[PDB]
Structure 1
């Protein structure tokens, strides 16, 4: 038996870290490109699987 694929999860900060919070949303965009990176990391995993 050999694992081949994995669950193709995909996070979204602007809803995970905080949903329906615009003040958190612009506070997030103050942090910068963490979350465009994380969606990039996880879509890289998802394409990989």
Structure 2
């Protein structure tokens, strides 16, 4: 097994500013696919043990 990691879309891209999150919702599902891919790694890391 490897080290299980998780990446937040809000805290990494935006500095908790109101102008960053308004243009982030126009980009949509770009970090939704990247969040659920790392979730699907962390399920399979427990299945390897």
TM-score w.r.t. the length of structure 2 is 0.78
Query: How big is each residue's C-alpha offset from its partner over 1:1-45, in whole Å with a ceiling of 9 and x where there is no partner?
Result: xxxx11110001111111312211121111110111111010011
Higher helix share: 2
Moved over 4 A (4+): none
Task: Flag structure 1 segments of 5+ consecutive residues without an equivalent.
Answer: none
Task: Flag structure 2 segments of 5+ consecutive residues without an equivalent.
Answer: none
RMSD: 1.0
Name the count of aligned residue pairs: 45
